[PDB]
Enzyme design. Structure first.
Site, PDB file in Angstrom:
ATOM      1  N   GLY A 113       0.825  -1.215   0.000  1.00 10.62           N
ATOM      2  CA  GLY A 113       0.000   0.000   0.000  1.00 10.62           C
ATOM      3  C   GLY A 113       0.847   1.246   0.000  1.00 10.62           C
ATOM      4  O   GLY A 113       2.027   1.172   0.375  1.00 10.62           O
ATOM      5  N   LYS A 114       0.268   2.376  -0.446  1.00 12.19           N
ATOM      6  CA  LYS A 114       0.990   3.668  -0.544  1.00 12.19           C
ATOM      7  C   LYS A 114       0.138   4.873  -0.128  1.00 12.19           C
ATOM      8  O   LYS A 114      -1.080   4.762  -0.079  1.00 12.19           O
ATOM      9  CB  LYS A 114       1.572   3.938  -1.955  1.00 12.19           C
ATOM     10  CG  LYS A 114       1.917   2.696  -2.749  1.00 12.19           C
ATOM     11  CD  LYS A 114       3.200   2.898  -3.554  1.00 12.19           C
ATOM     12  CE  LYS A 114       3.063   3.976  -4.616  1.00 12.19           C
ATOM     13  NZ  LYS A 114       4.378   4.199  -5.292  1.00 12.19           N
ATOM     14  N   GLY A 115       0.803   6.011   0.162  1.00 10.72           N
ATOM     15  CA  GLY A 115       0.149   7.250   0.658  1.00 10.72           C
ATOM     16  C   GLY A 115       1.007   8.123   1.585  1.00 10.72           C
ATOM     17  O   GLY A 115       0.487   9.014   2.287  1.00 10.72           O
ATOM     18  N   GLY A 157       4.522   7.846   2.028  1.00 11.47           N
ATOM     19  CA  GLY A 157       5.308   6.639   2.033  1.00 11.47           C
ATOM     20  C   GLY A 157       4.617   5.447   1.428  1.00 11.47           C
ATOM     21  O   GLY A 157       3.539   5.557   0.868  1.00 11.47           O
ATOM     22  N   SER A 158       5.237   4.296   1.580  1.00 16.73           N
ATOM     23  CA  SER A 158       4.720   3.098   1.047  1.00 16.73           C
ATOM     24  C   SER A 158       5.014   1.968   2.061  1.00 16.73           C
ATOM     25  O   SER A 158       5.912   2.104   2.872  1.00 16.73           O
ATOM     26  CB  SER A 158       5.319   2.847  -0.364  1.00 16.73           C
ATOM     27  OG  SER A 158       6.477   2.078  -0.314  1.00 16.73           O
ATOM     28  N   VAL A 159       4.196   0.919   2.074  1.00 18.30           N
ATOM     29  CA  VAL A 159       4.434  -0.191   3.003  1.00 18.30           C
ATOM     30  C   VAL A 159       4.683  -1.445   2.148  1.00 18.30           C
ATOM     31  O   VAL A 159       3.867  -1.744   1.272  1.00 18.30           O
ATOM     32  CB  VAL A 159       3.270  -0.413   4.003  1.00 18.30           C
ATOM     33  CG1 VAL A 159       3.553  -1.631   4.897  1.00 18.30           C
ATOM     34  CG2 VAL A 159       2.969   0.890   4.866  1.00 18.30           C
ATOM     35  N   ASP A 196      -6.135   9.726  12.836  1.00 17.83           N
ATOM     36  CA  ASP A 196      -6.587   9.044  11.592  1.00 17.83           C
ATOM     37  C   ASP A 196      -7.274   7.722  12.017  1.00 17.83           C
ATOM     38  O   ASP A 196      -7.070   6.680  11.408  1.00 17.83           O
ATOM     39  CB  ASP A 196      -5.387   8.877  10.590  1.00 17.83           C
ATOM     40  CG  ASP A 196      -5.848   8.689   9.096  1.00 17.83           C
ATOM     41  OD1 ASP A 196      -7.018   8.873   8.797  1.00 17.83           O
ATOM     42  OD2 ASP A 196      -5.008   8.385   8.217  1.00 17.83           O
TER      43      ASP A 196
HETATM   44  O1  LIG Z   1      -1.100   0.044   9.638  1.00 17.27           O
HETATM   45  C1  LIG Z   1      -0.476  -0.194   8.603  1.00 17.27           C
HETATM   46  N1  LIG Z   1      -1.297  -0.276   7.544  1.00 17.27           N
HETATM   47  C2  LIG Z   1      -0.951  -0.585   6.229  1.00 17.27           C
HETATM   48  C3  LIG Z   1      -1.178   0.412   5.275  1.00 17.27           C
HETATM   49  C4  LIG Z   1      -0.909   0.192   3.918  1.00 17.27           C
HETATM   50  C5  LIG Z   1      -0.388  -1.052   3.502  1.00 17.27           C
HETATM   51  C6  LIG Z   1      -0.154  -2.023   4.484  1.00 17.27           C
HETATM   52  C7  LIG Z   1      -0.451  -1.842   5.877  1.00 17.27           C
HETATM   53  C8  LIG Z   1      -0.073  -3.005   6.771  1.00 17.27           C
HETATM   54  C9  LIG Z   1      -0.392  -4.324   6.329  1.00 17.27           C
HETATM   55  C10 LIG Z   1       0.026  -5.436   7.008  1.00 17.27           C
HETATM   56  N2  LIG Z   1       0.778  -5.381   8.110  1.00 17.27           N
HETATM   57  C11 LIG Z   1       1.120  -4.206   8.615  1.00 17.27           C
HETATM   58  N3  LIG Z   1       1.864  -3.932   9.766  1.00 17.27           N
HETATM   59  C12 LIG Z   1       1.918  -2.565   9.869  1.00 17.27           C
HETATM   60  C13 LIG Z   1       1.296  -1.969   8.796  1.00 17.27           C
HETATM   61  C14 LIG Z   1       0.705  -3.001   7.946  1.00 17.27           C
HETATM   62  C15 LIG Z   1       1.019  -0.504   8.775  1.00 17.27           C
HETATM   63  C16 LIG Z   1       1.722   0.651   9.447  1.00 17.27           C
HETATM   64  C17 LIG Z   1       2.312   1.781   8.850  1.00 17.27           C
HETATM   65  C18 LIG Z   1       2.839   2.784   9.616  1.00 17.27           C
HETATM   66  C19 LIG Z   1       2.753   2.704  11.004  1.00 17.27           C
HETATM   67  O2  LIG Z   1       3.223   3.745  11.788  1.00 17.27           O
HETATM   68  C20 LIG Z   1       2.139   1.588  11.615  1.00 17.27           C
HETATM   69  C21 LIG Z   1       1.608   0.558  10.844  1.00 17.27           C
END
Ligand SMILES: O=C1Nc2ccccc2-c2ccnc3[nH]cc(c23)[C@@H]1c1ccc(O)cc1
Ligand code: NA
Length: 284
Positions: free
Chosen positions: A15-17, A18-20, A130
């Protein structure tokens, strides 16, 4: 202990919006390593870096069953935030797929856990900003956790709100009136957003009933741009609220309306929300 960049293997973009991203930390090079979630910046301006480092210190100081777990940071600045991977994804997607096979009692289990994680966060004087089902993650059938601390602010020492001077992208359909008018965020504005989360849960994420769809219909679908925010402010000042979801018990709907009070001081606390929802659960 450290994460070496060379051993972080790419698997999937999440996912994105940074990116994970989904990665495997595989120091042994034989694919037996732990699968992890990695956040990184895609546009690394000096302002965003400093925001991201604050996000990192916030997540690291938090330890609670209903808060996503920090694991570390990988250096090379171009930091990567290393976190646990929660395989069931966001509560929003999870509820969508498994709809009314999740009963009211299960919904109340998740709602309790959401309130506990939020109450713990408030004891450190953090405002999530959020809170929404897409930013709640599901660990398994019996546990959810609060995620994406991207928008989280720390309260000033001498103040009970934090005032955002130049807002970026904002989830207006979850925002308290004072956040819309004065860009003020507090434990009480988190509680307002929680009311909208509880609405989300009891609609089972039916698209035609989402908060944006409902509010747009109330102000009229011809409203555009900043005129939306203007009309949404007037509507909320005159007691326009989201409706009771189809089949929602009357008492859970009372809680939503209570969190959506114009008077910041009259909204309930997360400590009392968790107590009340546990009481509903036991009753059922
Ligand atoms: O909560 C999250 N959500 C997303 C958002 C977009 C794409 C993936 C995820 C995700 C999916 C699966 N496992 C995750 N662990 C933490 C994050 C996350 C993620 C995360 C990102 C920043 C943060 O400070 C804490 C958690
Ligand atoms: Na990588």
């Amino acid at each position: 202990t450290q994460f070496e960049e060379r051993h972080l293997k790419f698997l999937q973009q999440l996912g994105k919006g940074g990116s994970v991203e989904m990665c495997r930390y595989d120091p042994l090079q034989d694919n037996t390593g732990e699968v992890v979630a990695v956040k990184k910046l895609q546009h690394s301006t000096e302002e965003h870096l400093r925001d991201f480092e604050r996000e990192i210190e916030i997540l690291k100081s938090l330890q609670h069953d209903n808060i996503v777990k920090y694991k570390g940071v990988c250096y090379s600045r171009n930091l990567k935030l290393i976190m646990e991977y929660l395989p069931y994804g966001s509560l929003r997607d999870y509820l969508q797929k498994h709809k009314e096979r999740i009963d009211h009692i299960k919904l109340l289990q998740y709602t309790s856990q959401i309130c506990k994680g939020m109450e713990y966060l408030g004891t450190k004087r953090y405002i999530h900003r959020d809170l929404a089902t897409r930013n709640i993650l599901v660990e398994n059938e019996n546990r959810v956790k609060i995620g994406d601390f991207g928008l989280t602010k720390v309260l000033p020492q001498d103040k009970e709100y934090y005032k955002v001077k130049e807002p970026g992208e904002s989830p207006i359909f979850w925002y308290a009136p004072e956040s819309l008018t004065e860009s003020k965020f507090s434990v009480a504005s988190d509680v307002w957003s929680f009311g909208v989360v509880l609405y989300e849960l009891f609609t089972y994420i039916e698209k035609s009933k989402s908060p944006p769809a409902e509010f747009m219909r109330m102000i009229g679908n011809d409203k555009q741009g900043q005129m939306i925010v203007f009309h949404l402010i007037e509507l909320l000042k005159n007691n326009g609220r989201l409706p009771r979801p189809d089949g929602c018990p009357d008492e859970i709907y009372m809680i939503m309306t209570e969190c959506w009070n114009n008077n910041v001081n009259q909204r309930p606390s997360f400590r009392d929300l968790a107590l009340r929802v546990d009481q509903i659960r036991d009753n059922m």
